[PDB]
Design a protein around this nucleic acid. Structure first.
Ligand code: MG
Length: 93
RNA sequence: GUGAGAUUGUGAAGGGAUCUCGCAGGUAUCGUGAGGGAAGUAUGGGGUAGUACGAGAGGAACUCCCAUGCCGUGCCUCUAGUUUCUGGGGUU
């Protein structure tokens, strides 16, 4: 983000992202039981949400459901570079 | 088989055969829902916010409330309209 801290809540499988570009809308995703949702503390990494499971295309599916809720609408996306972006794809073991 | 009719072109009482269909439904209520029809559509305000963005000039948006235009289906408590209740009165 550029100006507004994106606040991503994680309780259970549910995930709530608020304050995306200062909007008052809350965006809601119900992650399946096959994928676990974690969150790194801001001591180590600034803001990371962790999607882990066994199916590749259920972990990759949920990380792009999350990417596409937070899309900039009716402004220039070259200037408004805000969102939730996948940077790394790893294993657990 | 059993009931009911008819055989009406030349008089009458008789009674033979034959043909036609009647022989099981009527009445009353609660539902099914195929198929067909098919509808709601727009707007402004509040705050978000003078914030995002921007050198400045300027200048957004969603959740969320509050109303409104056009349309639709009704309704008659109120208000308004209508009076051959010629209702009560007035007046030529
Ligand atoms: Mg239908």
């Amino acid at each position: 983000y550029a100006h507004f801290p994106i606040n991503v809540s994680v309780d259970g499988q549910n995930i709530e992202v608020r304050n995306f570009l200062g909007e008052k809308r809350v965006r809601r995703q119900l992650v399946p039981s096959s994928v676990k949702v974690s969150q790194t503390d801001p001591s180590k990494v600034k803001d990371e949400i962790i999607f882990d499971g066994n199916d590749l295309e259920q972990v990759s599916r949920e990380a792009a459901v999350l990417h596409q809720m937070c899309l900039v609408k009716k402004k220039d996306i070259r200037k408004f570079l805000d969102g939730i972006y996948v940077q790394t794809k790893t294993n657990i073991e």
